[PDB]
Amino acid sequence: AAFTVTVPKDLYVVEYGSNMTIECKFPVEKQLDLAALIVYWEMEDKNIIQFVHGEEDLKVQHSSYRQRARLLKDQLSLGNAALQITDVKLQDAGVYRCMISYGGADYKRITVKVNAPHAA
Amino acid sequence: AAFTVTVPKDLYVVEYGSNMTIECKFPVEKQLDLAALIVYWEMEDKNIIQFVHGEEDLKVQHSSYRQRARLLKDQLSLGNAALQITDVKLQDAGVYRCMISYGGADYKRITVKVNAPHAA
């Protein structure tokens, strides 16, 4: 099969203030060569995750996601580039993109909608 | 929006001996710069369409598709890279891929299943 990036779900509707995990899958034959894996997560014009050389590089991470966004490293060996974002706000609504380079390269879009908060 | 290639339909079930049009769409802002458009159609390890510099190049077209496959040029200005294949046989079943380069580049997969013929 050709190198393809796939998303099990391309539309998330999350409640205000909750935590969400948007998932993105890439092919991992045999074992995982972590050195060759590059994972970029970004929504709109802001970077969220720049995973290069086995670590997350914070150089270009948008300040909104400081201590709020996380890429589970241990799931990468299963071909899962799952992105976690906690305490989502209305500014987190938009189109996310998941760009993965591991031998080949591909990307998919994911749409997230955030509901308005419920009053007291 | 980011440069993306999309397919309105990713699974075709066609009858034996019929004609099918599998569609693939790419973004065309303003007018179409035909010189910059490159469209590749291929299924399995065989090329079907190599559209470069405004014409189809037959250099690598698989012989099965000689006078059988066609890329409608006039629809390219609408962002439609629609592939026509006539008199489909059981050998035409498999995964097609639609690779488009126009400024950016992207590709999508399409699965075609061909029914067995009905007897007399």
Binding site: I38, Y40, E42, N47, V60, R97, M99, S101 | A2, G104
Partner: peptide
């Protein structure tokens, strides 16, 4: 215009220049 550090962001990946990055568009 164009954000900073797009050179480090793009020099190792095809994500930019293929139209995939909105942070660093192909011609920013």
């Amino acid at each position: 215009g164009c954000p900073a550090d797009c050179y480090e962001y793009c020099r190792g990946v095809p994500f930019c220049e293929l139209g995939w990055s909105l942070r660093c568009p192909p011609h920013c």
